[PDB]
DNA sequence: CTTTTCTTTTAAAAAGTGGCTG
RNA sequence: UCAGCCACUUUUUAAAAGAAAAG
């Protein structure tokens, strides 16, 4: 058990100290149970009694609650913890099935008390100083200090990591064509080997663990077939999760809300096409712990819909480097979409949804690349090369958005797909003004203090106007009062401003917005047929400005 | 076991704390190219492995430079720099060539190798630490740690400087006519010889890097098809400017007059005489936009009179050591693409374009990646530093990208933004 | 191996004319093309590079054109020298390569062929040989047809022929064809008969003679 | 200037190698951009792209003959050779050696050549030959404008002369093209003399081949 | 003859939660 | 009972961009 492998040399964060936290006098019962467990603990060279000159420790509680063989005691290094020097935890994230290749043989080996197997560092070990409380009787009382990794100290998972990982470098230098896949204590082994020949390998690597010091038992994944490895159930061609046991009823509370919204995220995996925008706004308001939201109706029906899509069953298939993977993506929602990675036509490798507003004036267009980019260098970490595209968008449109648009954008390989609720650009500001049409010079302004301003503009035919308004500010009026022109016009007009505020915002092109103004000037242009946005410089007067200037003032 | 030389004291500025930056995705291919390139050097050991205890943290990727050598990792110590202490040494030590950009040929020599030679600050090695990433996360990402000088680190050539000074001194002197300067892992080569002899003086130069201090530069492949290298070498006095200003128009329109009075009155701030006064007088009242063309001759005497002020030898510019310098991208048209460096605003030292050459290489990001790489190079050649770039595109996204287009040794700093229409005229 | 052809094998023309020559590739080439001149002397002088620009010294009238699979090279107003062969090239592929060059010949009026044939000499004879020749000389286009025929029309196994390159000065053209036969068969033989048919008259332009002798 | 010039063996067995040299002067095989090709114009044909030497040592072979041909350089002495092994028939011809250069980035092309050698692959030996004349015969003084004639049979090394009466005749004669017969040449020239002219007047042809050392003369 | 202040607006990062992992 | 992954929601942070103010 006990391991012979070198130590890392931790810690504690610059400038403090070991923890002094005060032990309570246990209940003499709970004495009885920790020192049992502690005489055990110190066999297992796991612990060892220390000398009256550590001003060190750690509490330990009695809560024996837990399975009833290896039923453990407990100590909070919390406060330790707090102090424990910052570690680089070292990970990009936890292994997805979607990049596991479809191997012949394979094989889950565990590992029983890991965390109790390496050692800790000798020279930090006088901070692990938990006092079992004597009883009442007994003026002084019992000391020891852990010798190997405390489960519950920060960096007890990581140390354990770069611990387990060098056990395992030695034995892959010496046969690259076993594959050795491993987090914390689930060693995953798999390779062309016949199943005969494959545990003749295992034998070995099962062997070097154990001269290192780490027991793997038959508690390990026996059958070919079923390997519940990182709650994935891999199967000789599929990879699953029964487990989609939704929170039933119990939705009568926020907090279920919650639980309710990220298991379905979870779902999402293997899961098709699933939105939680809906639900996820139940969420926004709330602060309070144990109350409950008035759902809105919106999530009534996507809850009823989503959940269609819970209770059929599905899979995901391996992946083989030979065939590529092609990211097909979907919308569906006012803003949200949906993307399959997958390498044949039916058989769906992973699947992942997009939801946000990664600004404030972002359309369908935008809302597109951000979902693609979103979904390479998120296959770049599963499988190592980037995905060919499938974008519910057209040739055209594309070419027409990255030619205006004088902010740089891409995206790779793309095909053209026809199956959805057509991703497209809205409007268009024409180029050129349109000869023969109101030159609506506009404008706005509000004092600073007043906290109120007028709206307003002038047109080509000396037509005036002006809406002095509330809670609305000089950048608001601006943008507000070109409203006014789109308004008060046809469908073909020519919009001078003096804001570069606003010229920006409408150049853009905007789908949607959380704004309600900016969202409506948008729906005026969705109508309108021809479109003009010209600036000039606000104060110093040029063509109807002046005027409008003097009006809106 | 490197040199036997002394290790120099390097300590990080004040109150920072080195850096803890995370290691973004890498592709399989990189991945690789990055897990090979590195062991070969624990081998030699010019780097150690080290576990979770080492806090801090710093990224690397590899790039496939088109060269018959091998491929380059590249760590992006822009972090560790600015946490890293100041150098005597990279300032007046490394004062810089006047007639860098005065040559008609200057080539770029990754001296790099030249690095292995010098072991790192014992004390120092923890925050030069970078972390190979993994296909899937198999297997933890391994982390190494920097045992000897590291590629790309404002310290490498300050400490290594009075070593390379020696190994050049040689050929500096035989070769006086040429201009050498050194900047992160490159090395400015320029003559004024022919093409040819240029050519040839380089590499005469890339061997005898070799027999002093075994200073191994790459070996490039040239090719016969599309002539790249031939491209390679690079022509300072062949550097044109940006005065295309000067509009022109025969039916004067008024939204013509008012395009160029906003340009023109923004002008005002990178010009002395920019009176549109005159301009505004033509557009006095709410005249219909889209058709009347006042063509009035009045104005088209002092608009020729300010046409003359925007072509000359702009007065205000000037370059200050001290401050910094700043470079401004701007999508300009097709595939052309337009920057302006400048320290105190409104007053650039440099305004230069990017056009992208006749080729099948058509990636908005790939340009604009492309064109930063430019922008530094000319910046490095005249002045002798770096600009700080504002890039014309959205942050998440380059960040998916510029990898996969950039080709130098070094990177500069970048932050994003998204500025309107004045900033292109 | 990026194949390349140029279409047209021998041109017509004239001092002043105006010449464009074909050239097309297996597959794209970039504009990586270039045009070479051989004149009727043997020696290959560089014309233009990047199938469009001149090489120096060429002349200006020289010029390139194309793009992708298809290039032409354009003469504008022809010359004595510029009659000569031209050869297309691309070098996109490594493995260079030069389609067939193209003949730029001189126009000329018809002219019918001078026949002229001789009996084997005694000279010969004497040897058991027995060669009988046929000058064809001067006649316009190259295009022309000999009809080796011995009692009974058969083209006897035994002609070989050389045809000269168009005369500088005549610009016509010559075939000499000498017909091999042996003695014995020399002998055996009645009659024979050489005949050219040409565009100058459907009339195949015959001449023959008898004579045995050993 | 710039020039090169190719040396071969002019005549070699068939199944035996040559070596073809090209000397050049003016630019050189050391500097950057430079190079030298040899193109192959096989006798009455296109020219033929067969090898580049390249500057940088890297050059490049045709691939129907790499398996038979190499090439190299001594750039020292400012030569370049072309090597083909196992010569056949077909290979016959005149070799040329070509100064290629990358210009820039995008110009390449064969800048300068030379006047071609001539390498001839044949087991036939050195044959002088054999005039006959060709006296226009059952035919005399029928004709305004009577044409003489000249064959020239079996003879191997190509160079071949034929003149007309010491060098006297030159309007009006023809000597056409070699061609090859049991593995000799055979030319067969003519002149056409007026009828006033050739009865009277004597009209002899006279072959040369300088490879035999053979000059001779024919009446008639 | 001009200049400091202080805003209005938008971006990108911290903080308890949630699902999952061991 | 700790550490990591992603997805949520409330805040801050800076800041850059403009704007107004003003003396």
């Not at chain 1, 996507?302 to 590529?324: C, F, Q, T």
């Not at chain 2, 001290?322 to 030292?349: C, H, M, R, V």
């Not at chain 4, 190719?6 to 070699?12: A, F, H, K, L, N």
Request: net charge neutral; charged share 25%; proline share 7%.
């Amino acid at each position: 058990p006990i391991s012979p492998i070198e130590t890392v040399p931790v810690k504690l964060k610059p400038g403090m100290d070991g923890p002094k936290v005060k032990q309570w006098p246990l209940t003499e019962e709970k004495i009885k149970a920790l020192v049992e467990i502690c005489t055990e603990m110190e066999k297992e060279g796991k612990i060892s009694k220390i000398g009256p000159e550590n001003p060190y420790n750690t509490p330990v509680f009695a809560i024996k609650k837990k399975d009833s063989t290896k039923w453990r005691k407990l100590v909070d290094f919390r406060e330790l913890n707090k102090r424990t020097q910052d570690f680089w935890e070292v990970q990009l994230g936890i292994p997805h099935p979607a990049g596991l290749k479809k191997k012949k043989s394979v094989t889950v080996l565990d590992v029983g008390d890991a965390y109790f197997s390496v050692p800790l560092d000798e020279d930090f070990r006088k901070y692990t100083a938990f006092t079992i409380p004597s009883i009442n009787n007994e003026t002084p009382g019992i000391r020891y200090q852990y010798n190997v990794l405390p489960q519950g100290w920060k960096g007890s998972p990581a140390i354990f990591q770069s611990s387990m990982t060098k056990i395992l470098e030695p034995f892959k230098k010496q046969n690259p064509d076993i594959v050795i896949y491993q987090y914390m204590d689930d060693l995953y082994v798999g390779s062309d080997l016949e199943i005969g020949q494959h545990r003749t390998k295992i034998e070995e690597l099962r062997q070097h663990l154990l001269r290192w010091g780490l027991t793997t038992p038959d508690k390990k994944h026996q059958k070919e077939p079923p390997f519940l490895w990182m709650g994935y159930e891999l199967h000789p061609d599929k990879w699953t999760v029964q487990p989609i046991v939704l929170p039933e009823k119990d939705s009568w509370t926020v907090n279920d809300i919650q639980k309710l919204v990220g298991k379905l995220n979870w779902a999402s995996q293997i899961y098709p096409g699933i939105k939680v925008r809906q639900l996820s706004k139940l969420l926004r308001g709330t602060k309070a712990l144990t109350e409950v939201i008035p759902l809105t109706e919106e999530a009534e029906l996507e809850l009823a819909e989503n959940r269609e899509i819970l209770k059929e069953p599905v899979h995901g298939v391996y992946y083989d480097p030979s065939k590529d993977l092609i990211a097909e993506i979907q919308k569906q929602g006012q803003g949200q979409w949906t993307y399959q990675i997958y390498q044949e036509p039916f058989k769906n490798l992973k699947t992942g949804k997009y939801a946000r507003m990664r600004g404030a004036h972002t359309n369908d267009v935008k809302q597109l690349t951000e979902a693609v980019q979103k979904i390479t260098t998120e296959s770049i970490v599963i499988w190592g090369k980037t995905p060919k595209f499938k974008l519910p968008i057209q040739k055209e449109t594309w070419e027409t958005w990255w030619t205006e648009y004088w902010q740089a954008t891409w995206i790779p390989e793309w095909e053209f797909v026809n199956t959805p609720p057509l991703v497209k650009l809205w409007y268009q500001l024409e180029k050129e003004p349109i000869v023969g049409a109101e030159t609506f010079y506009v404008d706005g302004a509000a004092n600073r203090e007043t906290k109120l301003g007028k709206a307003g503009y002038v047109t080509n035919k000396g037509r005036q106007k002006v809406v002095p308004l509330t809670n609305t500010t000089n950048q608001k009026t601006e943008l507000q009062a070109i409203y006014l022109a789109l308004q008060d016009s046809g469908l073909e007009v020519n919009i001078v401003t003096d804001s570069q505020y606003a010229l920006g915002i409408i150049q853009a092109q905007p789908d949607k917005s959380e704004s309600e103004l900016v969202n409506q000037i948008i729906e005026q242009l969705i109508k309108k047929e021809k479109v003009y946005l010209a600036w000039v410089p606000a104060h110093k007067g040029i063509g109807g400005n002046e005027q409008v200037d003097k009006l809106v003032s | 076991p490197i040199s036997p030389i002394e290790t120099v004291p390097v300590k990080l500025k004040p109150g920072m704390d080195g850096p803890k930056v995370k290691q973004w995705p890498l592709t399989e291919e990189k991945i690789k190219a990055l897990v090979e390139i590195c062991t070969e050097m624990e081998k030699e050991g010019k780097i150690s492995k080290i576990g979770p205890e080492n806090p801090y943290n710093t990224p690397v990727f590899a790039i496939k430079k088109k060269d018959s050598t091998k491929w380059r990792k590249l760590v992006d110590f822009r972090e560790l720099n600015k946490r890293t202490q100041d150098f005597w040494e990279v300032q007046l030590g490394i004062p810089h060539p006047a007639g860098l950009k005065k040559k008609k040929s200057v080539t770029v020599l990754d001296v790099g190798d030249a690095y292995f030679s010098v072991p790192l600050d014992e004390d120092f090695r923890k925050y030069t630490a970078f972390t190979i990433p993994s296909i899937n996360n198999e297997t933890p990402g391994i982390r190494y740690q920097y045992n000897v000088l590291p590629q790309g680190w404002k310290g490498s050539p300050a400490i290594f400087q009075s070593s390379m000074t020696k190994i050049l001194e040689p050929f500096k002197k035989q070769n006086p006519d040429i201009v050498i300067y050194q900047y992160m892992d490159d090395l400015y080569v320029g003559s004024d010889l022919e093409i040819g002899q240029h050519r040839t003086k380089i590499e005469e130069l890339r061997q005898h890097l070799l027999r002093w201090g075994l200073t191994t530069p790459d070996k490039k492949h040239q090719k016969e098809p599309p002539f790249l290298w031939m491209g390679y070498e690079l022509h300072p006095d062949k550097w044109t400017v940006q005065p295309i200003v000067l509009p022109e128009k025969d039916s004067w329109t008024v939204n013509d007059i008012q395009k160029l009075v906003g340009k023109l009155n923004w002008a005002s701030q990178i010009y002395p005489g920019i009176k549109v006064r005159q301009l505004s007088k033509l557009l006095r009242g709410t005249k219909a936009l889209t058709e009347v063309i006042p063509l009035t001759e009045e104005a088209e005497l002092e608009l020729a009179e300010n046409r003359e002020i925007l072509k000359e030898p702009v007065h205000g510019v000037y370059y200050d050591p001290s401050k910094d310098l700043i470079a401004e991208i701007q999508k300009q048209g097709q595939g052309q693409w337009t920057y302006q460096i400048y320290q105190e605003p409104f007053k650039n030292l440099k305004t230069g374009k990017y056009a992208r050459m006749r080729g099948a290489h058509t990636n908005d990001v790939k340009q604009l990646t492309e064109a930063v790489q430019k922008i530094t190079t000319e910046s490095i050649v005249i002045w002798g530093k770096t600009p700080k770039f504002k890039l014309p595109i959205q942050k998440e996204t380059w960040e998916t990208w510029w990898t996969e287009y950039w080709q130098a040794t070094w990177i500069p700093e970048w932050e994003f933004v998204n500025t309107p229409p004045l900033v292109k005229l | 191996d990026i194949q390349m052809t140029q279409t047209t094998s021998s041109l017509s023309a004239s001092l002043g004319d105006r010449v464009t020559i074909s050239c097309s590739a297996s597959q794209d080439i970039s504009s990586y093309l270039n045009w070479y001149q051989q004149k009727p002397e043997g020696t290959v002088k560089l014309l233009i590079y990047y199938t469009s620009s001149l090489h120096s010294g060429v002349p200006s009238a020289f010029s390139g054109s194309g793009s992708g699979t298809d290039y032409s090279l354009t003469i504008s107003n022809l010359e004595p020298e510029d009659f000569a062969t031209y050869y297309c090239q691309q070098y996109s592929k490594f493995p260079w390569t030069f389609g067939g060059g193209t003949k730029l010949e001189i126009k000329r009026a018809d002219a019918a062929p001078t026949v002229s044939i001789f009996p084997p000499s005694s000279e010969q004879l004497t040897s058991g040989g027995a060669s009988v020749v046929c000058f064809l000389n001067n006649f316009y286009p190259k295009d022309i047809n000999v009809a080796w025929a011995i009692d009974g029309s058969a083209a006897a196994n035994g002609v070989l022929n050389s045809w000269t390159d168009q005369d500088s000065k005549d610009s016509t053209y010559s075939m000499s064809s000498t017909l091999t036969l042996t003695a014995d068969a020399y002998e055996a033989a009645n009659s024979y008969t050489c005949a050219a048919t040409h565009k100058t008259s459907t009339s195949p332009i015959v001449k023959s003679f008898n004579a045995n002798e050993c | 200037q710039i020039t090169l010039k190719e040396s071969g063996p002019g005549i070699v067995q068939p199944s035996q190698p040559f070596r073809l040299t090209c000397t050049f002067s003016g630019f050189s095989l050391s500097t950057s951009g430079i190079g030298v090709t040899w193109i192959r114009q096989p006798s009455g044909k296109g020219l033929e792209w067969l090898a580049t030497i390249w500057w940088d040592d890297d050059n490049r072979y045709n691939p129907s003959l790499k398996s038979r041909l190499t090439v190299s350089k001594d750039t020292s002495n400012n030569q370049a050779f072309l090597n083909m092994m196992t010569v056949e028939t077909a290979d016959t011809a005149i070799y040329y050696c070509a100064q290629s250069a990358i210009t820039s980035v995008t110009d390449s092309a064969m800048d300068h050549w030379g006047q071609g050698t001539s390498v001839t692959v044949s087991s036939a030996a050195t044959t002088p030959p054999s005039v006959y004349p060709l006296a226009p015969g059952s035919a005399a003084q029928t004709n305004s404008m009577v044409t003489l004639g000249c064959l020239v049979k079996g003879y191997f090394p190509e160079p071949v002369t034929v003149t007309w009466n010491s060098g006297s005749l030159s309007s009006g004669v023809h000597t056409f093209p070699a061609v090859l017969q049991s593995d000799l040449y055979t030319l067969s020239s003519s002149v056409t003399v007026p009828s006033s002219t050739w009865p009277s007047e004597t009209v002899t042809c006279n072959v040369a081949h300088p490879a035999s050392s053979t000059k001779v003369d024919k009446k008639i």
